Design a protein around this ligand. Structure first.
Ligand SMILES: CC(=O)N[C@@H]1[C@@H](O)[C@H](O)[C@@H](CO)O[C@H]1O
Length: 164
């Protein structure tokens, strides 16, 4: 079985956090993590797809730099719960960010996710960014499992932050 147990709207990073061309700035500080977004059981197989809606203004080592303002951009990761499992995002299409797993035929667990970003200074003049929509992540059932009657997609918004 599968049930949606998380939240539809999720904030990335602590609200109004401060961090000290182009040049990259934050580890896992600017992120959102939730190990329990869906409850799964009895053989349910699930992975995750991710999509970034921000405009791509460039790229660094194979991944897109998404634009926020003239001065600030972002490198973005989406994936399974643990931050080190994040998949570098490029473009604006749905991408496989977690290959997936199957819970035991006679057991239950949960499926989580994480979104992480790192600031990128595009233009220099402190830099402040306001709450901005980043994109979404949708569960990807496989092996015959069904999204059935469950919310498959959740959204992410970047909390306001300041770069010194
Ligand atoms: C409570 C918990 O930690 N649940 C995790 C879940 O967040 C994760 O998405 C999944 C696949 O790695 O493995 C579960 O054990």
């Amino acid at each position: 079985a599968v049930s949606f147990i998380g939240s539809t709207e999720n904030d990335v990073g602590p609200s109004l956090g401060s961090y000290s061309l182009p040049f990259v700035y934050t580890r896992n500080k600017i992120g959102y993590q939730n190990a329990n977004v869906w409850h799964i059981s009895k053989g349910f197989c699930v992975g995750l797809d991710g999509k970034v809606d921000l405009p791509v203004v460039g790229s660094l080592d194979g991944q897109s730099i998404y634009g926020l303002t003239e001065e600030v951009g972002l490198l973005i990761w989406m994936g399974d719960t643990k931050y080190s499992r994040g998949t570098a995002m490029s473009g604006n299409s749905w991408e496989n960010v977690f290959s997936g797993w199957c819970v035991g035929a006679n057991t239950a667990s949960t499926q989580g996710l994480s979104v992480r970003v790192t600031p990128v200074i595009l233009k220099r003049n402190r830099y402040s960014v306001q709450k901005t929509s980043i994109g979404s992540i949708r569960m990807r059932p496989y092996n015959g499992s069904s999204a059935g009657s469950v919310q498959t997609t959740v959204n992410f918004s970047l909390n306001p932050f300041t770069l010194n």
